[PDB]
Design a protein around this nucleic acid. Sequence first.
RNA 1: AAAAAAAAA
Length: 505
Amino acid sequence: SKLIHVPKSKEVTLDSLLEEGVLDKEIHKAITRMEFPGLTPVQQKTIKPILSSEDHDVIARAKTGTGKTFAFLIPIFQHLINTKFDSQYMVKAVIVAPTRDLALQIEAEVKKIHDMNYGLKKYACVSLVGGTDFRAAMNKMNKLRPNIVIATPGRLIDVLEKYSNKFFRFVDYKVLDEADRLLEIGFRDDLETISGILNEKNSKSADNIKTLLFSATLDDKVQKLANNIMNKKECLFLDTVDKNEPEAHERIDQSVVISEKFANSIFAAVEHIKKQIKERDSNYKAIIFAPTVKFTSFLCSILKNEFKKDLPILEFHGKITQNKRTSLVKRFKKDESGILVCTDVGARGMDFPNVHEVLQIGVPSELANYIHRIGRTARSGKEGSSVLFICKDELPFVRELEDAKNIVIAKQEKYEPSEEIKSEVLEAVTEEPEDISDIVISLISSYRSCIKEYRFSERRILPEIASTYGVLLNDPQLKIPVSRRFLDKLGLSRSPIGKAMFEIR
RNA sequence: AAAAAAAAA
Ligand SMILES: Nc1ccn([C@@H]2O[C@H](COP(=O)(O)OP(=O)(O)O)[C@@H](O)[C@H]2O)c(=O)n1
Ligand code: BEF
Ligand SMILES: [Mg+2]
């Protein structure tokens, strides 16, 4: 399929698009009432193309915290006004996202447009997301008969394989927010299933639907991955970023804290926070990322016993009930201060206003997710910083980050923990030995799955991680007790590394 | 065992 690039011009505004006749009046009052300084560079660049009379797809790219949501959300409402008479009781646009909380966020943003103009409520919206009651959603779908659907791939398929002919038979638009992630292995087959059904069911033709791709991390390789879900002949790559320019935002003051062992990053983080609390007199809003659910829960337990007196500590990951997930996302959105301890569920898309800095103990599940992680701060013209707490074996990450992502940390700092602090932390650990083992084993699993990606040294990285088990009990010489059946189940029985991390007990 | 992702996740 045809593909054209349009790098970064004359300014565009709300009023302007009102004169050009590309945007209806009822939509103008909505964004106008929000009282923004003006349209984001990406929003100016993308809005008119999407409504173009030409049959074409788009793969826009813009840095984090730069109104990419409204950048596609506004055209939807425009197209919905331009077709209010034809098939009013049918879905005309489907938005897909990697995480549940993000899909609900995009919905909440549609609900903001509805608040800035009651005349737009006619174009109802429903979110089709896992974790929520299935029957209730369909009941809401029948009642409201929405024109906009916002879903997660899994739940969407469940609905599509049961109620396609009823609602999704006249879809005209299809949005992939965080497109790259949605085109990765594990989501690509799901998306190809979404696309195929919508195109097979579309009343006009199997190429009627136009596709919109959005993300802070994109190149031309995604067009190849998306070639199976893109129906139009021509495709427009709108980029508000130079080719070699870092995809990471420039307003982010990035730093990295290198350390001897892995466990020492925990002590480093607590020290950074403890300092940042006293230095800001509480009044501190931060997000702390971790590589594992079990280590997230563990890390949260530490910060509770350490900082619960000063700030609230919020645990956030996939093993938390969806009710609680939604609940805490709401709170942290309006909370002036607090520590959000989370996995990579909160890496992409999620918008928490005025978060001072982003912390990272370890590495993300994806190289690209580093750009998305620090992207949680410095949003909407705001400022922010980011600390990366790693050890002396995770440098290939920082290196590979420089090679590929074209991102290097300006501020490098070494760290070694004092003795007085280890006592403070290692005393505040209610976890039993058997439980601690599960926390470590999970980190080993985690860090092995990204040795190829991050160019780690399986030889020296894996033993260093597993050695944390000794540290947490204050016995470095000690190893993790495990049966010969499990050790062999890992496959490390063939490697010398196996004996360097475990003990057959 | 390992981050996401459907009413068995
Ligand atoms: N023209 C605009 C667009 C968005 N925003 C704000 O930017 C916040 C988040 O932007 P976003 O998450 O949609 O942008 P991305 O991070 O997806 O690129 C929103 O809550 C809006 O309030 C704005 O101030 N002005
Ligand atoms: F949604 Be963007 F990546 F902050
Ligand atoms: Mg976004």
